[PDB]
Amino acid sequence: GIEKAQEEHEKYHNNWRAMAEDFQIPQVVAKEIVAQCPKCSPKTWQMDCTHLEGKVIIVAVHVASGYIEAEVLPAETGKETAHFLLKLAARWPVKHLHTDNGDNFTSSAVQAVCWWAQIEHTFGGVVESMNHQLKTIITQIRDQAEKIETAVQMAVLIHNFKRKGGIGGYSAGERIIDIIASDLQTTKLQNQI
């Protein structure tokens, strides 16, 4: 397996995650294989903010499964963004946060919450598709509720558990639960063996 991984990286220069999945090697050997080349994540969340009918809607998307979590913000300050990030860290395990070079995400309160929750905060074609799909669902079920908050939460529910599309035919919640369960069993068997 190790010779197959070395020949595959010498031929096509694969990343360490695909080699660890396809050749069944622990991740430290694949990391050293990629690090020894001269030519050369289930817990990553991307954040964004948008506007809709004068309100500010903050959207956090889990990337490897397509999971959504949205909220209505009364303002675009830093304390409310830090509170939403604290609630997101208190609900799901967050290890790597991806954002844009903004003003509210670059704040002392949000950096204090990131330090207390031990999250790697990084600044930099999936999130635009997620926001566009959320906008189409919001325009679909707008007339079933009065305020925009109930419409946002019902759009989150429909996007999470009522859209069984894609190649596998799986919704977002079942995908993120199966991914984190398989990653937990993989880390357990690697810590045991």
Size of the site for Zn ion (CB under 5 A): 4
17 binds Zn ion (CB under 5 A): no
* Rounded distance between C-alpha atoms, residue 144 and residue 127, angstroms: 26
181 binds its own copies (CB under 8 A): yes
75 binds its own copies (CB under 8 A): no
Chain centroid to Cα 160, Å, comes to: 14
Task: Give the full edge-to-edge strand order of the sheet including 67-73.
Answer: 67-73, 55-62, 44-52, 96-99, 120-123
- Among positions 1, 2, 4, 15, the unique one binding its own copies when judged by CB under 8 A: 15
192 binds its own copies (CB under 8 A): yes
Minimum Å gap between C-beta 174 and its own copies is 6
18 binds Zn ion (CB under 5 A): no
- In sequence order, what DSSP letters do the residues of 11-33 get, joined into one string? HT---HHHHHHHH---HHHHHHH
Residue 45-64 contact track with its own copies, rule CB under 8 A, x = bound: ------------------xx
Please state, in angstroms and as integers, the Cα–Cα distance from residue 95 to each residue in 45, 64, 92, following that order.
Answer: 8, 13, 10
Residue (of 152, 141, 175, 136) closest to 69 by Cα position: 152
Q: Is 49 annotated as a binding residue?
A: no
Minimum Å gap between C-beta 80 and its own copies is 11
Return the one option of its own copies, Zn ion, none that residue 102 interacts with (CB less than 5 to 8 A, by type).
none
Binding site for Zn ion (CB under 5 A): 13, 37, 39-40
